[PDB]
Amino acid sequence: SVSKANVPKIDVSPLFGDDQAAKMRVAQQIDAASRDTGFFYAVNHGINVQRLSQKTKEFHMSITPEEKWDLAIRAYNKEHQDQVRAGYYLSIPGKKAVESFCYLNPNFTPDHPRIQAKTPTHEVNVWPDETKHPGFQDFAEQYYWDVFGLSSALLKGYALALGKEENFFARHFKPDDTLASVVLIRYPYLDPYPEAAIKTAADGTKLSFEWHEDVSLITVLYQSNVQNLQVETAAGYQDIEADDTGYLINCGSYMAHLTNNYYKAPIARVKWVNAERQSLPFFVNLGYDSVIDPFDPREPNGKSDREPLSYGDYLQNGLVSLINKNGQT
Ligand SMILES: CC(C)[C@@H](NC(=O)[C@H](CS)NC(=O)CCC[C@H](N)C(=O)O)C(=O)O
Ligand SMILES: [Fe+3]
């Protein structure tokens, strides 16, 4: 028998305002949730989520094989050596069900010095033909900045929760240099569903994606209304109920590092479900040279002996390790 995770629904709208005590009352709830299962739903968040699923499904349904190859990351097309992160992630019929499209900071252009320097984890986005996908690039770039705004406010909530000034995290989260990414993920309905795309967990649960900590500061996720996620607790894996108006929020391993494990990075997995569904994570990554000084809010003097980690190298390491562990998505 599988239990259900405590995932509180937190009205985050005060984090956009100027009522500081109201922000503290949000921060308290973020602290509580981060110390419990590690997940909460952000509600009253102001993002129009009503068509995100439709647009994601329709883009994947309508993009042709030729277009997928043309946009494909290096793992699927050796001609695209510069596309490590951004671009199309093809399914493999009979073997791999999921397909997805990842894009980065729209401000990463050939003019950007990190592109000029060929710094790892920085790439220029690739986009399909506008006339074949009218409005898609516009929608996607706008969505990036919409979720950027929400994420900056959430980061104020996390900073207050930890006893810091509200810009402790968000001052490192900037449009000119953020390594944050959006992934537009389609999980298809398949009949018959290929068993090779299903992994069996140690506890016997059929899965589409194995256990992992997120590589992020925090993760800001919209999913369509099909229950799939589970979070690991000491009592075992627990189901995360879907909420296809709220945003599912949790800390990544960078936050676990800098708080000296006071806010752990929850371990989650994706159960296999034979259902058309859409999943849109926004990974809140900082700049390549962003460094946050660790602290230990469990200690009277607040001091941590842990090394400040440069975020870019953390991201570099984290993305490769997740591929090595859980497979190329
Ligand atoms: C909701 C999650 C479980 C989602 N999975 C995911 O997004 C998984 C696990 S967090 N994430 C990744 O593979 C990292 C993608 C990083 C991205 N290509 C980039 O370069 O920045 C899913 O639906 O599979
Ligand atoms: Fe994850």
Swiss-Prot record:
<feature type="binding site">
    <location>
        <position position="187"/>
    </location>
    <ligand>
        <name>N-[(5S)-5-amino-5-carboxypentanoyl]-L-cysteinyl-D-valine</name>
    </ligand>
</feature>
<keyword id="KW-0479">Metal-binding</keyword>
<keyword id="KW-0408">Iron</keyword>
<dbReference type="InterPro" id="IPR044861">
    <property type="entry name" value="IPNS-like_FE2OG_OXY"/>
</dbReference>
<feature type="binding site">
    <location>
        <position position="277"/>
    </location>
    <ligand>
        <name>2-oxoglutarate</name>
    </ligand>
</feature>
<comment type="pathway">
    <text>Antibiotic biosynthesis; penicillin G biosynthesis; penicillin G from L-alpha-aminoadipate and L-cysteine and L-valine: step 2/3.</text>
</comment>
<dbReference type="GO" id="GO:0005506">
    <property type="term" value="F:iron ion binding"/>
</dbReference>
<dbReference type="InterPro" id="IPR005123">
    <property type="entry name" value="Oxoglu/Fe-dep_dioxygenase_dom"/>
</dbReference>
<feature type="domain" description="Fe2OG dioxygenase">
    <location>
        <begin position="174"/>
        <end position="286"/>
    </location>
</feature>
<feature type="binding site">
    <location>
        <position position="89"/>
    </location>
    <ligand>
        <name>isopenicillin N</name>
    </ligand>
</feature>
<keyword id="KW-0560">Oxidoreductase</keyword>
<dbReference type="InterPro" id="IPR002057">
    <property type="entry name" value="Isopenicillin-N_synth_CS"/>
</dbReference>
<feature type="binding site">
    <location>
        <position position="181"/>
    </location>
    <ligand>
        <name>isopenicillin N</name>
    </ligand>
</feature>
<comment type="function">
    <text>Isopenicillin N synthase; part of the gene cluster that mediates the biosynthesis of penicillin, the world's most important antibiotic. IpnA catalyzes the cyclization of the tripeptide N-[(5S)-5-amino-5-carboxypentanoyl]-L-cysteinyl-D-valine (LLD-ACV or ACV) to form isopenicillin N (IPN) that contains the beta-lactam nucleus. The penicillin biosynthesis occurs via 3 enzymatic steps, the first corresponding to the production of the tripeptide N-[(5S)-5-amino-5-carboxypentanoyl]-L-cysteinyl-D-valine (LLD-ACV or ACV) by the NRPS acvA.</text>
</comment>
<dbReference type="GO" id="GO:0031418">
    <property type="term" value="F:L-ascorbic acid binding"/>
</dbReference>
<keyword id="KW-0045">Antibiotic biosynthesis</keyword>
<feature type="binding site">
    <location>
        <position position="181"/>
    </location>
    <ligand>
        <name>N-[(5S)-5-amino-5-carboxypentanoyl]-L-cysteinyl-D-valine</name>
    </ligand>
</feature>
<dbReference type="GO" id="GO:0042318">
    <property type="term" value="P:penicillin biosynthetic process"/>
</dbReference>
<feature type="binding site">
    <location>
        <position position="85"/>
    </location>
    <ligand>
        <name>isopenicillin N</name>
    </ligand>
</feature>
<feature type="binding site">
    <location>
        <position position="212"/>
    </location>
    <ligand>
        <name>N-[(5S)-5-amino-5-carboxypentanoyl]-L-cysteinyl-D-valine</name>
    </ligand>
</feature>
<feature type="binding site">
    <location>
        <position position="214"/>
    </location>
    <ligand>
        <name>N-[(5S)-5-amino-5-carboxypentanoyl]-L-cysteinyl-D-valine</name>
    </ligand>
</feature>
<feature type="binding site">
    <location>
        <position position="268"/>
    </location>
    <ligand>
        <name>Fe(2+)</name>
    </ligand>
</feature>
<feature type="binding site">
    <location>
        <position position="214"/>
    </location>
    <ligand>
        <name>Fe(2+)</name>
    </ligand>
</feature>
<feature type="binding site">
    <location>
        <position position="279"/>
    </location>
    <ligand>
        <name>isopenicillin N</name>
    </ligand>
</feature>
<dbReference type="GO" id="GO:0005829">
    <property type="term" value="C:cytosol"/>
</dbReference>
<protein>
    <recommendedName>
        <fullName>Isopenicillin N synthase</fullName>
        <ecNumber>1.21.3.1</ecNumber>
    </recommendedName>
</protein>
<feature type="binding site">
    <location>
        <position position="279"/>
    </location>
    <ligand>
        <name>N-[(5S)-5-amino-5-carboxypentanoyl]-L-cysteinyl-D-valine</name>
    </ligand>
</feature>
<feature type="binding site">
    <location>
        <position position="89"/>
    </location>
    <ligand>
        <name>N-[(5S)-5-amino-5-carboxypentanoyl]-L-cysteinyl-D-valine</name>
    </ligand>
</feature>
<feature type="binding site">
    <location>
        <position position="85"/>
    </location>
    <ligand>
        <name>N-[(5S)-5-amino-5-carboxypentanoyl]-L-cysteinyl-D-valine</name>
    </ligand>
</feature>
<feature type="binding site">
    <location>
        <position position="212"/>
    </location>
    <ligand>
        <name>Fe(2+)</name>
    </ligand>
</feature>
<dbReference type="Pfam" id="PF03171">
    <property type="entry name" value="2OG-FeII_Oxy"/>
</dbReference>
<comment type="similarity">
    <text>Belongs to the iron/ascorbate-dependent oxidoreductase family.</text>
</comment>
<feature type="site" description="Transition state stabilizer">
    <location>
        <position position="209"/>
    </location>
</feature>
<keyword id="KW-0963">Cytoplasm</keyword>
<keyword id="KW-0847">Vitamin C</keyword>
<dbReference type="InterPro" id="IPR026992">
    <property type="entry name" value="DIOX_N"/>
</dbReference>
<comment type="subunit">
    <text>Monomer.</text>
</comment>
<dbReference type="Pfam" id="PF14226">
    <property type="entry name" value="DIOX_N"/>
</dbReference>
<feature type="binding site">
    <location>
        <position position="187"/>
    </location>
    <ligand>
        <name>isopenicillin N</name>
    </ligand>
</feature>
<dbReference type="InterPro" id="IPR027443">
    <property type="entry name" value="IPNS-like_sf"/>
</dbReference>
<dbReference type="GO" id="GO:0016216">
    <property type="term" value="F:isopenicillin-N synthase activity"/>
</dbReference>
